[PDB]
Amino acid sequence: TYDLIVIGFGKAGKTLAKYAASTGQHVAVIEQSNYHLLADDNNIDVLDFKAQFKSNTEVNLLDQHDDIVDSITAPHIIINTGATSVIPNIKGLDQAKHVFDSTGLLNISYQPKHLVIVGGGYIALEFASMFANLGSKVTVLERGESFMPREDQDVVAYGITDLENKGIALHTNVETTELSSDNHHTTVHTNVDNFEADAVLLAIGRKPNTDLALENTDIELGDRGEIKVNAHLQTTVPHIYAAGDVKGGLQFTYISLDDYRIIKSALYGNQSRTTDNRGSVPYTVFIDPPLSRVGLTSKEAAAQHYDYTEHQLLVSAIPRHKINNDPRGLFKVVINNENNMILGATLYGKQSEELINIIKLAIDQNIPYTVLRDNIYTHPTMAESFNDLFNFHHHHH
Amino acid sequence: TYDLIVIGFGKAGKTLAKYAASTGQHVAVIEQSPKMYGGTCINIGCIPSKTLVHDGLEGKSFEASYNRKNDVVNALNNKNYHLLADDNNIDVLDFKAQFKSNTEVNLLDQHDDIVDSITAPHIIINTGATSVIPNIKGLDQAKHVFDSTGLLNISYQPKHLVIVGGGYIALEFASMFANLGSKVTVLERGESFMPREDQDVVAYGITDLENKGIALHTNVETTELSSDNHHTTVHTNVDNFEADAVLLAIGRKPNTDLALENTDIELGDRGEIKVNAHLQTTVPHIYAAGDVKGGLQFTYISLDDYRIIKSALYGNQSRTTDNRGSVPYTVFIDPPLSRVGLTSKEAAAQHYDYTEHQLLVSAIPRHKINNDPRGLFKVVINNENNMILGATLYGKQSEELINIIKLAIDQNIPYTVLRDNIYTHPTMAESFNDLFNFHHHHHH
Ligand SMILES: *[C@@]1([N])=N[C]=NC2=C1N=[C]N2[C]1O[C]([C]OP([O])(=O)OP([O])(=O)O[C][C]([O])[C]([O])[C]([O])[C]N2C3=[C]C([C])=C([C])[C]=C3N=C3C(=O)[N]C(=O)N=C32)[C]([O])[C]1[O]
Ligand SMILES: Cc1cc2nc3c(=O)[nH]c(=O)nc-3n(C[C@H](O)[C@H](O)[C@H](O)COP(=O)(O)OP(=O)(O)OC[C@H]3O[C@@H](n4cnc5c(N)ncnc54)[C@H](O)[C@@H]3O)c2cc1C
């Protein structure tokens, strides 16, 4: 019988357990398979079992033999079980060899001479960049009509160019029909071609990890197998919360950290934090250079009928690029003309994963783009490019 | 006759010249050296200095780094020149400018002869600074003694570089040349290195420099320089140091060699051109921008001087030296030491009820990706209103991150916003979640 139980070792549950322990509460963390910073705490018991609900109030602990070892309870339970790679139903998967998801690839024994990636998502493009830099010939197959479709399209054109210049082969409108393996190698059979590879990466998305007997509970699932949560991350049973990837939406480590803020606010604070007031959420696609994003693209701003102005700056026009010895990239911003507020930004270039946080703060705090234009920046840096990136007049659309 | 005369191809000058020309005005820009097209930063300052620091961090040799420094300097010098000269409303005049009167400027060739004279209703003095040559016995006879600019053009890698001076520029050359394999000794006359900086963070730079093999000394009075033919000895009160090359880096003074006696332009206690809050000299139609008017010597201060002068001559005159906002800066040692606002010593001396909180870079998970555990992040907060008084970031990406805290200070964003914000991951910026967490609720 505990004070708080978190199920899973994600970021939200781990930091929530550490906070509750400093309060003095006795916490139970259930994790099937950093590590000491939780166990070594006097007020936290990490249980190496598999969690499975017996009711809305008690949780069964299963050993590796799927036997019930013990049952545990607490007035509040946090579900934080993450997600798993989506396995595609294709011909010859269970028999094919040298096939990997994202986790299996990160633990690969060898460097592939030819890595084929089925899937063209952000994670897929990241791995293609990481392995081209390591000398691997990389082919990636996208089923859709274009790469990174939710991103600004003449920025991604620069990204595709820089990816191709590294020897990466991109393909669009590719249906993959069959996988076969001649033992040491594996061939991917597609609509356009049949590629031979040393390793095949399945990178076609992650689906919530919802395996803990929800039939014994009143916890509901949404359209896509995610745990349904309200604005305070409450499931349909009010004393049980869901955080991280196991509920729907954005799958980021920092979103999981913000989930802890919401749940702590609901359980220990004034309950003012919700999923409706996270502020603008930035993200980075770690290609080379990194593509960082926050707010709208100009395509979205035009679709929502903003009176907007967009402006761009090639990284080759940024003098700091000469010190970096890297001319690749494109910086792009979208501005609201009514006020002078920033609607969104796409920074494709070095330091973009750091610079993007400046624009995030400006959007949240209603700092007009004129302030970023006229500000004093350190020199020589990439940040000082904001003197030029935001140096423009209204073009009224 | 021109509409605007700019004396010196500095940062404020070239930027103001380019704007006025877009307006339709005819601008004359006087620059004495064709090796100086673009200013001190492009040719003998920030750009060549940090090109060598960046390349030395990458394992490039001395010869390879210096060759790429030449290409980068030559490319930007040529770029800066044509950005101005090719404008139909800007004439770049290759002469030394000297005032004939309050209203017209002589153009002198390198033999100090007057070739012609020009005039304009507004004149901008943007002549920068020069290295302070110290009065030391044997300097005018010692060999292998270098400027900051002489060192950036050195034709050999020194086995032992001895640095007279311990300012920011001196420590940047020490780190730069240590990373290139040179043995470096640096000598500071004062009691301590980098005063006015958070001396807790300074002790980190010091140890990180010493762990690279840099020898540092304080309370050192350099009394004499002597040289044989291939070695130079620096005679001090503690020791004699034998060197391949000696760097004199003890500050830079305003360059006012403009025959100001033919004008009513006044000079201040420290040889600077006196200016008001709108950067007007004591002659109202003459402005002074950049290093020559004293104060902070940075390229971005010079760029902000263009904003003040443009505001005064073309805009609503609201921009002054009194509303620049908080001024960040970076000392480009390895990793860079970046700073904005008050030090905790300053906050304590003014009697704030302040909170200081630090975070070691080795406690930032991104450092493992960076392959560098060195650094210390530090913030100083006013406890009565949660405002950010200052910060010192010593670590990777600090020269970028410091601009976030600058923005927060200027806009009166309380530290709790930076503490609770969502940051990209994995980054150095997300360390702010911990750096700005004072753990007030960490109790029973
Ligand atoms: C049961 N039944 N009982 C006990 N414990 C259980 C259990 N089922 C599962 N588990 C355990 O639960 C945890 C879950 O951990 P985690 O971290 O998945 O939880 P959470 O809070 O949802 O975290 C989400 C977050 O980690 C994730 O979004 C990021 O990893 C996303 N991400 C990312 C992901 C992949 C797959 C790759 C290849 C790369 C990246 N890169 C980034 C990136 O650069 N930035 C970013 O912000 N996010 C990235 C587990 O231990 C189970 O055993
Ligand atoms: C080694 C070193 C490293 C530095 N690193 C950095 C750094 O990393 N970041 C940073 O922000 N700052 C840095 N600085 C400072 C920066 O170089 C200066 O603060 C800045 O360039 C000042 O520019 P300015 O507008 O005052 O004029 P300057 O850029 O100094 O230009 C003045 C110009 O006027 C010309 N001139 C002078 N007198 C006459 C005359 N009579 N007639 C005609 N022309 C004339 C000169 O030839 C020169 O081209 C560094 C400085 C040095 C020395």
**A201 and A290 part of one domain:** no
Burial class of residue B437, CB neighbours in 10 A (0-12, 13-18, 19+): middle
What is the phi/psi pair of residue A122, to 5°? -60, -45
What is the phi/psi pair of residue B72, to 5°? -65, -45
* Bridge partner residues of A295 (DSSP): A344
Cα–Cα nearest to A30, from A3, A75, A61: A61
Within 8 A by CB and 6+ apart from A111, the residues are: A131, A134, A135, A136
How wide is the angle at C-alpha A283 spanned by C-alphas A277 and A285, nearest 5°? 165
A264-289 burial code (b ≥16 CB/10 A, e <16) = bbbbeeeeebebeebbbbbbbbbbbb
Show the ligand 2 pocket: residues with CB < 6 angstroms: A 379; B 7-12, 30-33, 36, 39-41, 45-46, 49-50, 96-97, 126-128, 148, 169, 255, 257-258, 289-291, 297-300, 302, 332
Q: How far is B53 from chain A (nearest CA, A)?
A: 9
Ramachandran sector of residue A305 (left: φ over 0; alpha: ψ -120 to 50; beta: rest): left
Give the H/E segment covering residue B56.
helix B46-57
A331 touches A388 (CB < 8 A): no
User: Would you call A380 and B46 a contact, using CB atoms and an 8 Å cutoff?
Assistant: yes
CA distance B76 to B73: 5
Q: Quick one: three-class SS letters along A350-397?
A: CCHHHHHHHHHHHHHHCCCHHHHHHCCCCCCCCHHHHHHHCCCCCCCC
- Sheet (strand B114-119) strand order: B96-99, B104-108, B114-119
**Count of H helices and E strands in chain B?**
13, 23
Helix (H, G, I), strand (E, B) or coil at A208: strand
Cα–Cα nearest to B409, from A158, A143, A190, A367: A367
Helix (H, G, I), strand (E, B) or coil at B151: helix
Within 8 A by CB and 6+ apart from A268, the residues are: A19, A23
In A, minimum Cα distance to B413 occurs at A365
CA distance A306 to A343: 9
B417 touches B431 (CB < 8 A): no
Q: Which of A80, A130, A219, A286 to mutate to test the pocket of ligand 1 (most atoms within 8 A of CB)?
A: A80
**B163 and B247 part of one domain:** yes
In DSSP notation, B256-279 reads: --S-GGGS---B-TTSPBP--TT-
Helix (H, G, I), strand (E, B) or coil at A231: coil
- Looking at residue A49, its amino acid is F
Give the H/E segment covering residue A124.
helix A122-133
A243 touches A79 (CB < 8 A): yes
A329-358 burial code (b ≥16 CB/10 A, e <16) = bbbbbbbbbeebebbbbbbbbbbbbbbbbb
* Bridge partner residues of A60 (DSSP): A52, A71
Q: Quick one: three-class SS letters along B383-397?
A: CCCCEEEEEEEECCC
CA distance A240 to A219: 9
Q: How far is A326 from chain B (nearest CA, A)?
A: 12
CA distance B423 to A355: 10
- Sheet (strand A176-181) strand order: A176-181, A186-190, A194-197
* Bridge partner residues of B341 (DSSP): B390
Instruction: Supply the DSSP symbol for B430.
Output: G
Tokens of A4: 């708080």
A191 touches A165 (CB < 8 A): no
The CB-based long-range contact list for B419-423 (8 Å cut-off, 24+ gap) reads B420/A261, B421/A279, B421/A357, B421/A360, B421/A361, B421/A364, B422/A254, B422/A255, B422/A257, B422/A258, B422/A278, B422/A279, B422/A281, B422/A282, B422/A360, B423/A254, B423/A282, B423/A357, B423/A360
CA dist list (Å): B337 to A378, B299, B381, B401: 12, 17, 19, 11
Give the number of beta-carbon pairs within 8 Å between A and B. Answer: 141
CA dist list (Å): A271 to A25, A265, A275: 20, 5, 11
User: Would you call B422 and A355 a contact, using CB atoms and an 8 Å cutoff?
Assistant: no
| Candidate from B338, B411, B425 with C-beta closest to A367 | B411
CA distance B295 to B268: 11
Domain of B200, CATH number, reads 3.50.50.60
Place of tokens 């940075």: B298
B337-346 burial code (b ≥16 CB/10 A, e <16) = bbbbbbbbbb
* Bridge partner residues of B216 (DSSP): B186
- Sheet (strand A283-285) strand order: A283-285, A291-295, A342-348, A330-336, A308-314
Tokens of A82: 């993450």
How wide is the angle at C-alpha A140 spanned by C-alphas A138 and A146, nearest 5°? 140
Tokens of A316: 């080759």
CA count, 13 A, side-chain hemisphere, A53: 19
Whether residue A112 has a cis bond before it, omega within 30° of 0? no
**B342 and B243 part of one domain:** no
Beta strands at A194-197 and A199-202: parallel, antiparallel or unpaired: unpaired
Tokens of B303: 């760029």
Give the H/E segment covering residue B84.
helix B62-85
User: Would you call B443 and A22 a contact, using CB atoms and an 8 Å cutoff?
Assistant: yes
A75 touches A235 (CB < 8 A): no
Tokens of B178: 């240590």
Tokens of A221: 């699932």
| Candidate from B400, B442, B444 with C-beta closest to A351 | B400
Helix, strand, coil in percent for chain B, rounding step 5? 35, 25, 40
CA distance B178 to B162: 11
Resolution in A: 2.4
Give the H/E segment covering residue A139.
strand A137-141
**B246 and B338 part of one domain:** no
User: Would you call A378 and B329 a contact, using CB atoms and an 8 Å cutoff?
Assistant: yes
> E-assigned strands of B82-221?
90-94, 96-99, 104-108, 114-119, 122-125, 129-131, 145-146, 160-164, 183-187, 215-217
Best B339, B422, B439, B443 residue to mutate vs chain A (most A CBs within 10 Å)? B422
Domain span holding position B394: 328-436
| Candidate from A323, A354, A375 with C-beta closest to B401 | A354
A306 touches A368 (CB < 8 A): no
Tokens of A108: 């690969």
The number of the ligand nearest the C-alpha atom of B7 reads: 2
**B339 and B425 part of one domain:** yes
Domain of A322, CATH number, reads 3.30.390.30
CA distance A304 to A307: 9
**A200 and A105 part of one domain:** yes
Ligand 2 atom showing the smallest separation from residue B297 Cα: 19
